[PDB]
Amino acid sequence: IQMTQSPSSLSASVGDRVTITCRASQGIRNYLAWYQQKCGKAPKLLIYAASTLQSGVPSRFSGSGSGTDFTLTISSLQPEDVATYYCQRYNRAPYTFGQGTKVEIKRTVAAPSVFIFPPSDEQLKSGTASVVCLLNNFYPREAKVQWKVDNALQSGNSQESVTCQDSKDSTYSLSSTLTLSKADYEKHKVYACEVTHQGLSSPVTKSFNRG
Amino acid sequence: EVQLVESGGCLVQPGRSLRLSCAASGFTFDDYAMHWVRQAPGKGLEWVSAITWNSGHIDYADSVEGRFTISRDNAKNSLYLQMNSLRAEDTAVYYCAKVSYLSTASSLDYWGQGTLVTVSSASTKGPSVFPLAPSSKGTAALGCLVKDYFPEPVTVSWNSGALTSGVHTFPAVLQSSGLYSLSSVVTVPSSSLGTQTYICNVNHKCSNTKVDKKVEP
Prior knowledge:
The structure holds two protein chains of two kinds. By secondary structure, chain A is mainly beta.
């Protein structure tokens, strides 16, 4: 009663062939389905019977194996194949799902659009003041965002978010959110994020001066 | 067009017990085994429970034995999961799923969209919505800030859903306070900025609140 997908992650480029495996600890036989789950959506059945393919699912998803070692192949990665993939046994309970396998499409570098937002007067009436810096459509996913109030480089008081890679063009968007209380924000003037990214020849600093 | 709608679960206290429902339609309910599969926020799928069409056999996972109970009311085309002794770590999205064929040794070919259950003693709070108005910083960007609410989730649409191109609604991120915070932003043609009205519609189901902020330069 146990199934091991391998590997955990994999970033492939478009056109590539991508192989995920799934190792059953008992003898599932033909009794294995493969599931695709796109970001923030339910899962979809791609493959069942280890090797049959659900209607309208593209020929490019193809799985195989029998009994104990199984293997899903995506013969030509498209941009919409960035999902997470799961295997599952269904001979008899427990109908166990595999550990998962996240797959990220790998495009050329793309620098990010950068915006910045001082705190609403709406929010200052409520005591706290958060500044939001936006990173709009980029790859690769990593980027160093650095806050600086009066050039004093802030630490420990900002939190990032990041969207899933786009199914169309495989780009991320990030938001860092600096969070001060009206009293801290009201002392300083020079408020800035500055963004380093691989797609950037030199760092960017969008900034504003009020507070 | 087969569809499975889950409901019932929002916020629930540890030790206590909540009951998830899954009315189904668009196929003969009497025929297919049903499952419950759950996904822990930021974790894999996990198989919870299973039941034959005539409620005549049943299985649970070890994670679940002794606390949950699957059940089904074929007459009211509906599938239940009584969840007792809820632990903090039961917090997950809970899906029901029809079986491919007239057999239990069969895959899951339609999934509901799944209700989020959160297990916590903390109390529910609707969110403060704040405007991220467009200033200096060809195109320009504006958005909303959905601050300090609990539990997950909120839904943000723009201009009642008519606006969709170029919208980022970020994953909520939990704060020191223990409340979630959120940003939803759009890229817009700046040309329109003085003529076009942009409104974000936030809607926090678990606190009955719903707000419609209008963003202005």
